[PDB]
């Protein structure tokens, strides 16, 4: 129906867009550089369109990429995506290992409230704020970390991952409490409690080790799971998700043990998701055929259930059930890819009419802590599955819509697994030469205006800009030059000594020096304006993205020879600020923008 | 009961405090300089605690000082004040002559609304605003200018004043309209109309010339005067004042003609002012004995009536009437000087517990367009009669009370005449060596703080202040020096050319240069911070009284030798802004504040 191989290729690439510093050598994202290098634990993924590392959804997302490989790794070698998926997973699992603090873990980097108040690119956030870390022993977060490491140890054949999976499971199982999990409250609160994480983790530890003691633990947790409403059934009217993986765990146990209780649960849960429902009860469906669990990330929930449904259908023999679940699964993935009332992809950079304004700071590429400028994203967030449409299939591509245009690690995770299943079956050719290079705009440049002209002086207002985005970055040794032709000065009988440079305004906190008038060649001379710590010119807000200086170059009062019209840097200037290529910008001795007299 | 000679001495000096530029060489006020030198007509008096020249009250005030000399000039020779009164009067009359524009006159300098919106000293107002002038031929204003010059011509024996008096009288009489008198609206509108000015001017012209044609004109105007309420009597229930001088004109005509109608009017009018009243009708009196005509300037009105009552009493023979009017007159002057329920003088700088916060911009001496700072006036407005108490004798000395602490030319004018009569009678010794010198504050100085510091730099925040007040003034070629000892630099094998001067903040609009590091003697060097137009540093507002610069002097980054503690200009600096004597200030090459290494 779609090129599922290309979709898979892009959905994996999304994770490279999310990587915190230091980036691996293989990172393919031209607009990403090392970022948040002062974080207490390095690497891992930024969670969503923000810069917080939230370990619960991060570990969940890793666990799901691990599960994708566990089911379909061999079946996707043809797509060419297996190696990409494996090393992207490893990057996250390495972070989880790096969080170990013995009887506790670092479970969050960054404060949600503080992070979210600011809109700008990852690489420059340390100029805006100082990022905290959080330590604890929450059973849900630690349990999920264990699960991700357990499946990761299988698929990546890695004994360190297994050792840490065991460590974290033991901690979580000994703690049996979410009370020390607080930093993510209101963002990723533990809603279901922790017994489902202990189930998920112990199940994966059993699949990793074959040690029946884990299967014993797993089966011991099921009576502690939340019930459906006031009945005795285990809750089934929700999705497998970052908060609650008992759904997937029961499917794994159905296949691993063959026991009827797990098959019963799997069928009741999946029937509730399908259009036929479960004895008169069913998830809400949009008229366009999307199973729509909640306002937040309906595509995430539906595509995750697609993966579970594929796995369960592949694991049973009953042809009616297999077809019902397979059809459900493929219908949800296909909706996401364009089988909907608008015939449009909800995967950024893929298919017909994809979203172009995902709620994502670093892909947007602002310089002034606004969402509306630039009006178009500077970068392509390939592969990101957006939140998706409302309950009635309605949708508008709007950066302000942090619900419908949300993107996140957990949104892509189950989706990757389902795309693995579909490319396994239908093939498809991934894109060669992916990703293609982006059109860039000017990043470092001066905007200048004639602040005042006089028969004896020129006064310039000059803003040295850092609107960098490929990647956003900091340059310390910034300077620019203003070139003049002094022929008229010498013809009048005057000298360079008779020309005075003064300052009429210099922006607070921008340490600046202006050189003496310096000879270039012939009658061409210049001044250099140097910012000693140019990293303070940075795309983090209205005040910081440019440093303003007003400088005056003056012959003596009363003289009538001054001619700015033959000065190279005056060319094209008006009374309104405008970018000029004739006041070139330098990083140390290297010219990075503009032109010099005589080329 | 008072030293009326000292009161007179000070009440005259008040006018010197009011003089606009260019000041005469004999001006005795150390805190006044040439001010408003760009005015369309130079000289004359600022009206009140403001800087508007309002010709109607100005000319009224001059006419009253003239009348004082006409009646009592010989009689005050012993007080030593005659020559002071004469030259003060001439300064105003010269302005009135200079207002001539042929078919019209300049009748105002300054926009009342813009003038009053700003709180600051006369000598610096042109940095704040441009002052318009206004031209017209309003009969009241021109008529009063005529009257002032007519009496002035007599008492100063001056043919030029008589010539302009006649010309202005003819202009006022030809025009017979206040329609072209607009700029004073709401401040000094013509309330009574212009017939009384024509009466007053023609009466003075008769007294000046002995030409009975002027007497005939004068008498021709009396049927045109306003009536008392609905009656046939000429209005008598008010005071002789800036708006209406018919009261005094009638007294002059009683003496000049002997005619019963004028005596009848004079006695009706003066009886209404006395405690005994006229036919049961009387001006309001306070319980403390002040005749209280209106909320605005009650002392002004009462002391003016005292002068009229003295003049009329001295012109009649009836001992009963003479004592009634003399007692009234003396009671009102004595109230103003301290014979009141609070035993307090209402004349600034005179007597017991005088007002210390008159509503007067220049005497206050602010630098930041505020009334509350400084909390005490920096100058003594000697001789100013304030508005005075309420109808219940209530009063508080508060700069904000522009009613009770109002001061003005017209408040002092009749008052001087009454003081002349009282000094004539009682003698008194004027103050020797008046005025005494004031305690002065520092006027031009740097406030500095260590803004940032490290092992390779010093960063200073420096505010170059102009809080001048003795007098307030402007200095264009302002600079200050920051002195260092570079011993440790050479000691480390580095040169002057290894020390970098940079700027971290330069206040907008303050064109500034910083010299290279310049040698003084030994290892002592300095940078000079020069303001190209230092007149923009001026005591006109919160933002203008000081220019802020943040400068950094830096050894190379990484180095460890930098030693600010042997730097002369570093001495005593803290992290909080404070005046420092070690960053000396210069006007051109002349030090005007502070100290220099080694003297
Ligand atoms: O009670 C029913 C059911 O609840 C399940 O728990 C739910 C919570 O009820 C629900 O509020 C929570 O919703 C999340 C949503 O899943 C996240 O995707 C969204 O994430 C934000 C993030 O918080 C921001 O930091 C970032 O900028 O944007 C992302 C993407 O929008 O956050 C909201 C609020 O936390 O989801 C829970 C899990 O589905 C229980 O699991 C189940 O047992 C209950 O029956
Ligand atoms: O109807 C009765 C009577 O009126 C007389 O005219 C009066 C006006 O009625 C009265 O409003 C006016 O009040 C003046 C007052 O004399 C001034 O001293 C005051 O001056 C201000 C000045 O305007 C400001 O610029 C400055 O900052 O402060 C000073 C405070 O002194 O201004 C008010 C308003 O103009 O006075 C008139 C004359 O007494 C008629 O003369 C009479 O014929 C009527 O019967
Ligand atoms: Br006119
Ligand atoms: Ca849970
Ligand atoms: Ca030139
Ligand atoms: Ca009048
Ligand atoms: Ca030193
Ligand atoms: Cl179905
Ligand atoms: Cl834009
Ligand atoms: Cl491509
Ligand atoms: Cl070039
Ligand atoms: Cl005082
Ligand atoms: Cl004295
Ligand atoms: Cl000295």
CATH of the domain at B475: 2.60.40.710
Residue listed under structure tokens 């983090």: A540
**Of A409, A436, A463, which marks where a domain is finished?**
A436
- Overall resolution, Å: 1.7
Residue A135's beta-bridge partner residues? A106
CA distance A54 to A110: 8
Taking CB atoms and an 8 Å limit, are B503 and A509 in contact across chains? no
Domain that residue B589 falls in: 440-596
Q: Which token pair is A512?
A: 């600046």
CB-CB contact of A107 with A181 (8 Å) = yes
- Tell me, yes or no, whether B303 and B268 share the same domain: yes
d(CA A92, CA A156): 12
Cβ contacts (< 8 Å) between A552 and chain B: which residues? 511
CA–CA separation, A54 vs A47, rounded Å? 6
A86 CA distance to ligand 10 centroid (A)? 22
Number of domains in chain A: 2
Rounded Cα distance between B368 and B365, Å, is: 9
Shared domain for A464 and A383, answered yes or no, is no
Q: Which of A502, A508, A532 sits opposite B513 (nearest CB)?
A: A502
Same domain, A418 and A448: no
Whole-number Å distance between alpha carbons of B446 and B580: 6
Distance, CA of B77 to chain centre: 26
Nearest residue to A56 via CA among A235, A195, A241: A241
CA distances from B137 to B102, B108, B182, B509 (A): 10, 11, 10, 42
- d(Cα B514, Cα B506) in Å, to the nearest integer? 11
Q: Are residues B64 and B150 in the same domain?
A: yes
Q: Is the CB of A188 under 6 A from ligand 1?
A: yes
Domain stop point among A380, A401, A436? A436
Same domain, A234 and A317: yes
Query: Rounded distance, CA B88 to CA B93, Å?
Result: 9
Same domain, B387 and B454: no
Residues B520 and B379 in one domain: no
Question: What is the rounded distance in angstroms from the CA atom of residue B240 to the CA atom of residue B547?
Answer: 50
Contact indicator for A532, A464 with CB cutoff of 8 Å = no
B423 and B477 housed in the same domain = no
In angstroms, what separates the C-alpha of A506 from chain B's closest C-alpha?
A: 5
The minimum-distance atom of ligand 1 relative to the CA of A402 is 31
Q: Are residues B332 and B249 in the same domain?
A: yes
Residue B215 burial (CB count, 10 A): 19
- Does B502 contact A512 at a Cβ distance shorter than 8 Å? yes
Q: How many CB atoms lie within 10 A of CB B123?
A: 25
3-state secondary structure of A304: helix
In whole angstroms, give the CA distance from residue B107 to residue B41.
Answer: 10
Tell me: do B419 and B464 sit in the same domain: no
Burial B373-408 (b: 16+ CB within 10 A, else e): ebeebbbbbbbbbbbbbeeebebebebebbebbbbb
Shortest-distance atom of ligand 1 to CA A403: 31
How remote is the CA of residue B596 from the centroid of ligand 14, in Å?
5
Nearest CB to A552 within list B507, B511, B554: B511
* Three-class secondary structure of residue B510 per DSSP: coil
**A396 and A462, same domain (yes or no):** no
What is the C-alpha to C-alpha distance for residues B191 and B198, in angstroms, rounded to an integer? 15
Domain boundary among B407, B436, B465: B436
Phi, psi of A135 (to 5 degrees): -125, 145
B360: its two tokens: 């007067």
From CA A64, how far away is CA A240, in angstroms rounded?
10
Nearest to B504 among A500, A502, A509 (CB): A509
CB-CB neighbors (< 8 A) of B512 in chain A: 502-504
Task: Kindly report the protein residue whose alpha carbon is nearest to atom 34 of ligand 2.
Answer: B187
State the method: X-ray
Which mutation among A108, A191, A248 tests ligand 1's pocket best, with the greatest number of atoms within 8 A of CB?
Answer: A191
Looking at the DSSP assignment, which residues form a beta bridge with residue B108?
A: B54, B134
Which residues of chain A have a CB within 8 Å of the CB of B477? none
As a dihedral over the C-alpha atoms of residue A446, residue A452, residue A458, residue A463, rounded to 10 degrees, the angle is -10
CATH number at residue B29: 1.50.10.10
Q: How far is CA A142 from CA A97, A166, B167, in A?
A: 11, 11, 103
State both tokens at A488.
């008229």
Residues B392, B461: one domain?
no
Q: Token match 């390779």: residue?
A: B456
């Amino acid at each position: 129906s779609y090129n599922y191989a290309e979709a898979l290729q892009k959905a994996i690439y999304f994770y490279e867009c999310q990587q915190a510093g230091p980036l691996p050598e293989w990172n393919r994202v031209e607009w990403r550089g090392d970022a948040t290098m002062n974080d207490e634990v390095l690497g891992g993924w930024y969670d969503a369109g923000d810069h917080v590392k939230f370990n619960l959804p991060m570990a969940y997302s890793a666990a799901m990429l691990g599960w994708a490989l566990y089911e379909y790794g061999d079946d996707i070698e043809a797509s060419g995506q297996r190696l990409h998926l494996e090393r992207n997973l490893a990057f996250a699992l390495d972070y989880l290992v790096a969080c170990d603090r013995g009887d506790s873990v670092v479970y969050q980097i960054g404060d949600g409230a503080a992070d979210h108040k600011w809109w700008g690119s990852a690489e420059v956030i340390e100029k805006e704020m100082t990022r905290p870390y959080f330590v604890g022993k929450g059973s849900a977060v630690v349990g999920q970390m264990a699960a991700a490491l357990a499946v990761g140890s299988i698929v990546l054949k890695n004994d360190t991952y297994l050792r840490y999976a065991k460590k974290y499971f033991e901690l979580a199982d000994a703690t049996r409490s979410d009370s020390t999990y607080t930093a993510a409250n209101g963002f990723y609160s533990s809603h279901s409690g922790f017994w489902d994480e202990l189930l998920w983790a112990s199940t994966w530890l059993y699949l990793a080790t074959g040690d029946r003691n884990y299967l014993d633990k797993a089966e011991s947790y099921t009576p502690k799971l939340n019930r459906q409403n006031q009945t005795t059934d285990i809750e089934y009217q929700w999705a497998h998700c970052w908060d609650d993986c008992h759904y997937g765990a029961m499917i794994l146990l159905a296949r691993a043990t063959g026991k009827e209780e797990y098959h019963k649960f799997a069928q009741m849960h999946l029937d509730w998701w399908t259009p036929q429902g479960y004895n008169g009860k069913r998830v809400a469906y949009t008229p366009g055929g999307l199973a729509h669990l909640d306002t937040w990330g309906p595509l995430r929930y539906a595509t995750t259930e697609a993966f579970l449904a594929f796995v369960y259908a592949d694991s049973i023999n009953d042809p009616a059930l297999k077809q019902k679940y397979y059809n459900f699964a493929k219908s949800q993935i296909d909706y996401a890819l364009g089988s909907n009332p608008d015939n449009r992809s909800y995967v950024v950079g893929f298919g017909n009419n994809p979203p172009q304004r995902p709620h994502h700071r670093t892909a947007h590429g602002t310089w002034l802590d606004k969402r509306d400028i630039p009006e178009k994203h500077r970068h392509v967030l390939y592969g990101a599955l957006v939140g998706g449409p409302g309950r009635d299939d309605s949708y508008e591509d709007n950066i302000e819509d942090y619900v419908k245009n949300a993107v996140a690690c957990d949104y892509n995770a189950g989706f990757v697994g389902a795309l693995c299943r579909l490319t396994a079956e239908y093939g498809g050719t991934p894109l060669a030469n992916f990703p293609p290079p982006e059109q860039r705009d000017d990043e470092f440049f001066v905007e200048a205006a004639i602040n005042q002209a006089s028969d004896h002086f020129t006064e310039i207002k000059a803003l040295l800009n850092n609107r960098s985005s490929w990647p956003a970055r900091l340059i310390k040794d910034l300077s620019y030059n203003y070139y003049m032709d002094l022929t008229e000065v010498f013809e009048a009988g005057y000298s360079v000594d008779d020309i005075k440079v003064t300052i009429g305004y210099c922006e607070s906190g921008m340490d600046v020096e202006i050189s003496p008038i310096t000879h270039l060649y012939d009658n061409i001379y210049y001044i250099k304006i140097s910012y000693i710590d140019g990293t303070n010119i940075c795309p983090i807000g209205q005040e910081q993205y440019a440093a303003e200086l007003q400088f005056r170059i003056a012959a003596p009062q009363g003289t009538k020879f001054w001619d700015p019209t033959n000065d190279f840097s005056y060319q094209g200037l008006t009374r309104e600020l405008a970018k000029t290529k004739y006041m070139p910008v330098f990083d140390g001795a290297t010219k990075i923008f503009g032109e010099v007299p005589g080329g």
